[PDB]
Amino acid sequence: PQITLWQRPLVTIKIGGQLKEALLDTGADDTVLEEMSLPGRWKPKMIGGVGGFIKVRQYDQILIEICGHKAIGTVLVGPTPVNIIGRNLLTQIGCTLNF
Amino acid sequence: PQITLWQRPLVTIKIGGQLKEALLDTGADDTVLEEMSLPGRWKPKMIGGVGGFIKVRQYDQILIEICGHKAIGTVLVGPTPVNIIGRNLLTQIGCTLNF
Ligand SMILES: Nc1ccc(S(=O)(=O)N(Cc2ccccc2)[C@H]2CNC[C@@H]2N(Cc2ccccc2)S(=O)(=O)c2ccc(N)cc2)cc1
Ligand SMILES: [Cl-]
Numbered sequence: 001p002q003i004t005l006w007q008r009p010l011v012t013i014k015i016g017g018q019l020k021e022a023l024l025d026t027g028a029d030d031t032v033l034e035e036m037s038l039p040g041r042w043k044p045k046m047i048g049g050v051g052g053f054i055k056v057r058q059y060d061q062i063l064i065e066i067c068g069h070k071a072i073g074t075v076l077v078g079p080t081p082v083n084i085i086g087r088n089l090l091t092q093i094g095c096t097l098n099f
Numbered sequence: 100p101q102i103t104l105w106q107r108p109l110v111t112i113k114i115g116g117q118l119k120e121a122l123l124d125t126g127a128d129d130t131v132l133e134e135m136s137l138p139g140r141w142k143p144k145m146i147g148g149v150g151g152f153i154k155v156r157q158y159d160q161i162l163i164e165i166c167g168h169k170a171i172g173t174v175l176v177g178p179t180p181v182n183i184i185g186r187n188l189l190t191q192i193g194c195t196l197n198f
């Protein structure tokens with residue numbers, strides 16, 4: 001697809017057996033989702049932006065589907081106000097900015 | 100251009116005759132720059148990041164060049180981690196996400 005930026009670039013994702021809505025975000029180095037359970041080991045991380053920092057849990061090697069496209073990578077989980085697909089996964093689906 | 104996302108999509112912008120580095124951020128609704136001087140009157144604006152809402156200065160109808168492409172629109176000024184070009188100006192330069 002070619003996604004317009006007139007509106008937020010929101011897409012459906014599938015992760016952990018769950019369908020969620022998420023923002024395709026080129027400014028985010030990492031993917032960050034609202035509180036959920038994921039399998040496997042994790043370690044704590046801090047991420048931050050305007051408004052300050054939040055503590056999240058870092059899970060590696062997680063499978064996700066984004067708009068039909070399968071990808072694997074690190075997912076951060078924590079008290080984010082919006083589900084974010086970051087560059088670590090956008091690269092895997094071949095997402096580019098074009099103008 | 101076509102910009103891949105293996106690294107931060109940092110580009111050069113020009114504003115007030117000064118060159119700056121800014122991030123192309125499809126997750127940001129609004130463009131926000133580090134503290135700087137802009138002409139005219141400003142209005143108050145709240146923006147929300149992962150850690151909460153903060154107050155920034157809103158300047159309307161500001162001339163800005165982004166990677167060689169001209170735009171005129173709203174620019175916010177405040178304590179942002181990095182200069183950010185958000186969707187209000189990415190739309191003006193014709194930017195889309197593609198995969
Ligand atoms: N590693 C890492 C660091 C930060 C984040 S993030 O702050 O959640 N996050 C996602 C987001 C939050 C809130 C609303 C919409 C998107 C970043 C990326 N897009 C916007 C947001 N921000 C920019 C940023 C922060 C740190 C490093 C580089 C850029 S931000 O500061 O909250 C922001 C929010 C709204 C506007 N107008 C401008 C800026 C995610 C992963
Ligand atoms: Cl990763």
Ligand SMILES: [Cl-]
Nearest residue numbers: 091094103104
């Ligand atoms: Cl590539």
Ligand SMILES: [Cl-]
Nearest residue numbers: 171172173187
């Ligand atoms: Cl605008």
